[PDB]
Design brief:
The complex is a heteropentamer of chains A (about 110), B (about 120), C (about 110), D (about 550) and E (about 110).
Chain A: E1 4-6, E2 21-25, E3 64-67, E4 70-73, E5 85-86, E6 105-106
Antiparallel strand pairs in A: 1-2, 2-4, 3-4, 5-6
Chain B: E1 4-6, E2 17-18, E3 20-22, E4 32-37, E5 69-70, E6 74-76, E7 78-79, E8 89-95, E9 113-114
Antiparallel strand pairs in B: 1-3, 2-7, 3-6, 4-8, 5-6, 8-9
Chain C: E1 23-24, E2 33-38, E3 46-49, E4 63-65, E5 70-74, E6 85-86, E7 89-90, E8 107-108
Antiparallel strand pairs in C: 1-5, 2-3, 2-6, 2-7, 4-5, 6-8
Classes of the chains: A mainly beta (about 110), B mainly beta (about 120), C mainly beta (about 110), D alpha+beta (about 550), E mainly beta (about 110).
PDB class: viral protein
Keywords: EBV, Glycoprotein B, Neutralizing antibody, Cryo-EM, viral protein
Assembly: pentameric
Chain lengths: ~110, ~120, ~110, ~550, ~110
């Protein structure tokens, strides 16, 4: 089955700082997936899926793309109170697997 | 629209407990629901969700346990045989395209209720 | 049909002698023939069939042999009570060109 | 577990195969007619006639006393007639009167009422119904008589002793005229063969027959007078039912003969080897006879084969004799007493020939049917050969129809790990026509490079080609992947049934025949072992053990 | 066993005379019988046969002069056209050989 992996989640960047975080896939799904964004204490929010399809009410700073086997999120100079937590999922291979994700990550302030 | 939830209650180990995902003002048929859990200290989780016409599929952890069904007014997962350390919060989700694409974060769902088994 | 050939109209010698009444036919005969003997006035009576053997009741003075076309008859010891005409009869059943079962001629002996 | 997922290629080179066109029929005993004639062993003892001579001398004690007469002594003295005067008892049947007796030099004469040395006549006496014919010559005081008796006798097979019908046993062969080494145990000088003098049989007294020779043995008391013969008057063989329409069969080890009227069938031991008789010389006269006659009445249908009458010997012991035909244009034997061994063989032979001809055809009708089945297997290949070549061979294969031969190849397996399916049959370009079959995506083994293609029938997938049809209104239809079916309503995976318990069509003509059950046989019996012993009218084991119970009283004290 | 003869009288040449007798002793169904004639001055001449299968045959000189027929207990003979020097005597066979002839009769 497919197995999800991810870079180390420890990041320490202030306002005027950015995010350099990607997730990797073992077997090639040809990159049909999205990300996850959620305020702690709140429901997760819908955002851009499928690397080119921005959703409703999405922010302009949240842009990330790629191709092949993986995408990458990279958002320059985030504001103060956003500091969300993130992960991805695997799209078009919904079956015979033990897990649909493989980890998680978080961005904070300094 | 959105959805409201019910069924959250503290319990002792050894008891089967169900829930109910209360729908509100949309098509009973033309969508698919979803379920995910997260205790504070980890991330998002397994379940894998309903088919639009009948029998469904899910993950490989609790094969033989959960007997998720559907009527024309609501959806519900049945938790028959359980463990104890699983003390998290469930969310009646909603996908868009193929198993949650177009709802890759997810489209529209509710705040969920916390369930916890602890002596 | 063929005709029999029954040539020698012989006479007897004295008692205790030999004769030979040998006759033949003109075709390929096959299995065997017969030899009768009858006194004047009565029914026939046979002695030899299939040119091979005698019959029960007639004594073993007679014999006979031959195969194919010519067939020999030999009497011996010539008791005077046995003196009459002799014959021949073919027995072969139907085939091509009709039957093959008829008598031939006549041959008598004269006791001296 | 069926055949798994696979992918086929290689239209260029494989092996070569060609449909046959001239399948032949590979299908799967001679017999001659005959005139057999069978003999059994003989058990009947040999018999002849006999006549006895005796003459009685009586001594009856009459007493003339005072109180009562003492009728005491009954004396029998049967005396034997000398040889030179028996003949007058046979010619005109006159009987001598006086007795002339010598004893140890002395000589005594007992006349019969101052009797005469000249003869006297006789008279037949009374007798029992179909008993013994016997004539008499009369109609301490002295009286005498002569006696003649006529009766039958019988003897056993290997010529030791012959016993008459009254009990006067005498140890000699019935064929012994001197100078012939046969069994003989009498002492001496008790034989005479007076050559050709006649006996007249009491109806007349003057007729002169041939009068063959006669022996005159007397033990000393009674003169037996049979007539002798040469020792060919007892053939050890006897006749039986002669069949007419047999048919022979030579297979393998030995021969079988099969008749049809008496429904029997004999079997012999050797193969061709004609045994010839050694001491059965009497029977060759009867069998040189009467083979003709049966040859005679079928003259217009058959001919002779050869003159050689052949013989045989079977297992139980019954010598056979028969001569072959052809169609035309225009010591002893000692047999074993039982039937039902020349009888059972019919029930196993005449059931063999009937079943074998029934299985003769249906090997023919099965072959002619398979030629027509071969032709249907040609025209199906011109439609789509990749299906029909699989079931005839045995596994999942592929071919690609080059010319007028078939192009067998070999497919490569695919890992069972990850299979996918597309959630929409719509072509993702516009609102025009759609695919007809649910194209899928997949990956190879041990390399993890993923591709996509189109799923065909019977879980076989070929790549790099599409097929479509014009989209129209709502009409669902199903598909069948590995171990499940799943329905598309119009263009979505609307349901998944996951039960292969939908009703099949059940096309199977049940050849539902039978077995053959095994009944066992009882053991019944028509005439018991006890019942045969009471069949005799006399009680032999009752007389003797009673006679010596009232006769042990001679020892009175 | 024997067989017998019945006929004679020496009737006029206009008569279609019949000549029959066959009596008893044995089963007639499975044997053969035959006619034969004697004439004074000369020998004998074979007439006809009848076999067990039911067919008949005739000799090589009188091919239309006679007819024979089996009556399942008796056999007979019919003469068609008599003349003044053919008919002297007749017999009764019981086979093709092996004398069972009997006394015979005279026309």
């Amino acid at each position: 089955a497919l197995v999800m992996t991810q870079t180390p989640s420890s990041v320490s960047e202030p306002v005027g700082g950015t995010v350099t975080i990607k997730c990797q896939a073992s077997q090639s799904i040809s990159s049909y997936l999205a990300w996850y964004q959620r305020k702690p204490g709140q429901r997760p929010k819908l955002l851009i899926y499928g690397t080119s399809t921005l959703a409703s009410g999405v922010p302009s700073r949240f842009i990330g793309s790629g191709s092949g086997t993986d995408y990458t999120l990279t958002i320059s100079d985030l504001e103060c109170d956003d500091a969300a937590t993130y992960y991805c999922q695997q799209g078009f291979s919904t079956s015979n697997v033990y897990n649909s994700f493989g980890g998680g990550t978080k961005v904070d302030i300094k | 629209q959105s959805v409201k939830e019910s069924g959250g209650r503290l319990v002792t180990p050894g008891t089967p407990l169900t829930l109910t995902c209360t729908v509100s003002g949309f098509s009973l048929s033309s969508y698919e629901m979803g379920w995910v859990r997260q205790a504070p200290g980890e991330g998002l989780e397994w379940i894998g969700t309903i088919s639009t016409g009948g029998s469904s599929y899910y993950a490989s952890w609790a094969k033989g346990r959960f007997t998720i069904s559907r009527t024309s007014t609501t959806v519900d997962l049945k938790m028959t045989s359980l463990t104890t350390a699983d003390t998290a919060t469930y969310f009646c989700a909603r996908g868009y395209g193929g198993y949650g694409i177009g709802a890759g974060y997810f489209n529209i769902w509710g705040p969920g209720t916390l369930v916890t088994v602890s002596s | 049909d063929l005709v029999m050939t029954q040539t020698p109209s012989s006479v007897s010698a004295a008692v205790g002698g030999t004769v030979t009444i040998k006759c033949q036919a003109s075709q390929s005969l096959g299995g065997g023939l017969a030899w009768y003997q009858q006194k004047p006035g009565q029914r026939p009576k046979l002695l030899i069939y299939s040119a091979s053997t005698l019959e029960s009741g007639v004594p073993s003075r007679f014999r006979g042999s031959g195969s194919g076309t010519e067939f020999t008859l030999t009497i011996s010891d010539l008791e005077c009570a046995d003196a009459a005409t002799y014959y021949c009869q073919s027995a072969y059943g139907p085939t091509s060109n009709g039957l093959f079962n008829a008598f031939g001629g006549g041959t008598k002996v004269v006791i001296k | 577990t069926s055949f798994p997922f696979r992918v086929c290629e290689l239209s260029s080179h494989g092996d070569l195969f060609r449909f046959s066109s001239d399948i032949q029929c590979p299908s799967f005993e001679n017999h001659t007619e005959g005139l057999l004639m069978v003999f059994k062993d003989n058990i009947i003892p040999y018999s002849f006639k006999v006549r006895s001579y005796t003459k009685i001398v009586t001594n009856i004690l009459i007493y003339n006393g005072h109180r009562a007469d003492s009728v005491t002594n009954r004396h029998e003295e049967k005396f034997s007639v000398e040889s030179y005067e028996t003949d007058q008892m046979d010619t005109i049947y006159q009987c001598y009167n006086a007795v002339k007796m010598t004893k140890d030099g002395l000589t005594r004469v007992y006349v019969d009422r101052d009797g005469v040395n000249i003869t006297v006549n006789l008279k037949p006496t009374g007798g029992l119904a179909n008993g013994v014919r016997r004539y008499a010559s009369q109609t301490t005081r002295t009286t005498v008589n002569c006696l003649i008796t006529d009766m039958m006798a019988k003897s056993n097979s290997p010529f030791d002793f012959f016993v008459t019908t009254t009990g006067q046993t005498v140890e000699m062969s019935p064929f012994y005229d001197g100078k012939n080494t046969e069994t003989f145990h009498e002492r001496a000088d008790s034989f005479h063969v007076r050559t050709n003098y006649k006996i007249v049989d009491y109806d007349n007294r003057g007729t002169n027959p041939q009068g063959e020779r006669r022996a005159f043995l007397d033990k000393g008391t009674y003169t037996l007078s049979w007539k002798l013969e040469n020792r060919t008057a007892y053939c050890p063989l006897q006749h039986w039912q002669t069949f007419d329409s047999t048919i022979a069969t030579e297979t393998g080890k030995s021969i079988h003969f099969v008749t049809d009227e008496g429904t029997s069938s004999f079997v012999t031991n050797t193969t061709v080897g004609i045994e010839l008789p050694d001491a059965f010389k009497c029977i060759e006269e009867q069998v040189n006879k009467t083979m003709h006659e049966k040859y005679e009445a079928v003259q217009d249908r058959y001919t002779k084969g050869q003159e050689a009458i052949t013989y045989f010997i079977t297992s139980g012991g019954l010598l056979l004799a028969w001569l072959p035909l052809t169609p035309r244009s225009l010591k002893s034997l000692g047999t074993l007493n039982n039937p039902a061994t020349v009888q059972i063989q019919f029930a196993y032979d005449s059931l063999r020939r009937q079943i074998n001809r029934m299985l003769g055809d249906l090997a023919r009708a099965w072959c002619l049917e398979q030629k027509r089945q071969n032709m249907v297997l040609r025209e199906l290949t011109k439609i789509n050969p990749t299906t029909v070549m699989s079931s005839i061979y045995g596994k999942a294969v592929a071919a690609k129809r080059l010319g007028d031969v078939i192009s067998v190849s070999q497919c490569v397996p695919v890992n069972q790990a990850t299979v996918t399916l597309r959630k929409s049959m719509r072509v993702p370009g516009s609102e025009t026509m759609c695919y007809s079959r649910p194209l899928v995506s997949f990956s190879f083994i041990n390399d993890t490079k993923t591709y996509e293609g189109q799923l065909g029938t019977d879980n076989e997938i070929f790549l790099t080609k599409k097929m479509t049809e014009v989209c129209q209104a709502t009409s669902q239809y199903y598909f069948q992947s590995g171990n499940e079916i799943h329905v598309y309503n119009d263009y979505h995976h609307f349901k998944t049934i996951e039960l292969d318990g939908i009703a099949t069509l059940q096309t199977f003509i049940s050849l539902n025949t039978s077995l053959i059950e095994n009944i066992d046989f009882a053991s019944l019996e028509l005439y018991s072992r006890d019942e045969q012993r009471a069949s005799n009218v006399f009680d032999l084991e009752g007389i003797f053990r009673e006679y010596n119970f009232q006769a042990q009283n001679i020892a009175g004290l | 066993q024997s067989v017998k003869e019945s006929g004679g009288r020496l009737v006029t040449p206009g008569t279609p005379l019949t000549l029959t007798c066959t009596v008893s002793g044995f089963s007639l169904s499975s044997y053969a019988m035959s006619w034969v004639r004697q004439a004074p001055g000369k020998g004998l001449e074979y007439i006809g046969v009848i076999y067990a299968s039911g067919s008949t045959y005739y000799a090589s000189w009188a091919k239309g002069r006679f007819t024979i027929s089996r009556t399942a207990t008796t056999v007979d003979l019919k003469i068609t056209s008599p003349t003044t020097e053919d008919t002297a005597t007749y017999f009764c066979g019981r086979g093709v050989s092996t004398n069972m002839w009997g006394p015979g009769t005279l026309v």
